[PDB]
DNA sequence: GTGTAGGTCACGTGACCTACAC
DNA sequence: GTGTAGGTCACGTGACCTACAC
């Protein structure tokens, strides 16, 4: 009775499922130059990438928001500008 | 001669190195609610996360830039405003 | 509950790629 | 080059968690 077979084979479809869905992670990142590097570092590098996107982003959106208040002072500026012009 | 030993043990430090550096990937992402889920999906989910950060970001920074040209028209507006005031 | 089955891990190994020596 | 060693994978298994039935 294949009880090794369908098993030894089940684990080979699971494992493939990673080796394929693994490069999906790596190539899903720049700083690996589409080549080699441990499947221990595809974790490393990208694990930093989250620090980066949270890092770089959070600020950056807030800086859209300081562009907001920036345009608030602008508001005041407009509130002054004229009382009858355009 | 431990030739199994230092080996069977070498592979156990490597493997740990993943199980630890693996959650470093998972927890390095929201949408997993700090709990369980295949070490095949920690790849899945986060693999999308790159699509997202490139996605959401690229645009968003460009929209800082349409805020740029937005403030360009503003420039013209200023170029009109007054020729002697403040 | 006692089946029969799928997914999910972690272990113990057997290749192969290096590259340091000497 | 022929050593002796480390890292890196992928395979073949042996547990355990379920949860569908019946």
């Amino acid at each position: 009775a294949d009880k090794r077979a369908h098993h030894n084979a089940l684990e080979r479809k699971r494992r493939d499922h990673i080796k394929d869905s693994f490069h999906s992670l790596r190539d899903s990142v720049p700083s690996l130059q589409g080549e080699k590097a441990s499947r221990a570092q595809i974790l490393d590098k990208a694990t930093e990438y989250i620090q980066y996107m949270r890092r770089k982003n959070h600020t950056h959106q807030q800086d859209i928001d300081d562009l907001k208040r920036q345009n608030a002072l602008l508001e005041q500026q407009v509130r002054a500008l004229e009382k009858a012009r355009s």
Side-chain angles (χ1 to χ4, degrees), chain A:
Chain A
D2 306 293
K3 212 46 259 191
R4 281 189 182 161
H6 276 294
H7 192 29
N8 294 163
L10 262 165
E11 262 262 310
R12 257 178 309 101
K13 202 70 134 60
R14 165 182 120 65
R15 296 183 260 259
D16 267 310
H17 206 310
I18 316 293
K19 164 224 50 179
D20 293 323
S21 295
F22 228 90
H23 69 258
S24 300
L25 211 210
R26 164 179 98 239
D27 283 4
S28 145
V29 330
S31 80
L32 277 177
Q33 108 269 201
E35 252 178 298
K36 61 172 64 131
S38 330
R39 97 158 141 211
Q41 221 118 221
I42 310 192
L43 289 210
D44 292 323
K45 303 331 285 165
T47 210
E48 256 134 59
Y49 223 99
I50 260 98
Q51 183 218 165
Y52 241 59
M53 295 340 120
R54 155 189 172 227
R55 181 185 230 173
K56 187 181 318 301
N57 255 310
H58 178 214
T59 269
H60 173 90
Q61 314 279 311
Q62 191 106 298
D63 269 9
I64 206 178
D65 311 310
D66 226 359
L67 263 58
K68 187 278 133 4
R69 142 146 265 79
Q70 188 261 241
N71 266 7
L73 99 59
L74 191 134
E75 283 185 297
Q76 305 273 336
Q77 221 271 1
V78 114
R79 273 69 183 257
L81 152 62
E82 69 202 15
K83 49 147 69 186
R85 254 294 154 86
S86 68

